[PDB]
């Protein structure tokens, strides 16, 4: 079944799980070392289960920046009149 978003993919999903068949992804692509998508390097994100570019990933952790990294409260504007 050829239902993988990744182009130039030659993986056979004749017998895959509902987690790989539903999301339309390969087990090898799910936890691969940066796939070649649209020419650029795009890795998987177990956080959102979607696909994110490499520029978005950072640090030893290969996950999304949101939540993982931590935006923290912090302040921007001040109170006054
Ligand atoms: Zn694939
Ligand atoms: Zn994500």
UniProtKB/Swiss-Prot annotation:
Disulfide bridge map: none
Inducing factors: Negatively regulated by microRNAs miR156 and miR157.
Chain ranges of zinc fingers (SBP-type): 1-78
Protein name: Squamosa promoter-binding-like protein 4
Sites where the protein binds Zn(2+) 1: 4, 9, 26, 29
Residues that hold Zn(2+) 2 according to the record: 45, 48, 52, 64
Tissue expr: Expressed in the rib meristem and inter-primordial tissue of the inflorescence apex.
Phylogenetic classification of the source organism: Eukaryota, Viridiplantae, Streptophyta, Embryophyta, Tracheophyta
Subcellular localization: Nucleus; Cytoplasm
Domain of life: Eukaryota
Function summary: Trans-acting factor that binds specifically to the consensus nucleotide sequence 5'-TNCGTACAA-3' of AP1 promoter. Promotes both vegetative phase change and flowering.
Short sequence motif Bipartite nuclear localization signal: positions: 61-77
Signal peptide start-end: none
Composition skew (Basic residues), residue ranges: 68-77
Free-text comment about domains: The SBP-type zinc finger is required for the binding to DNA.
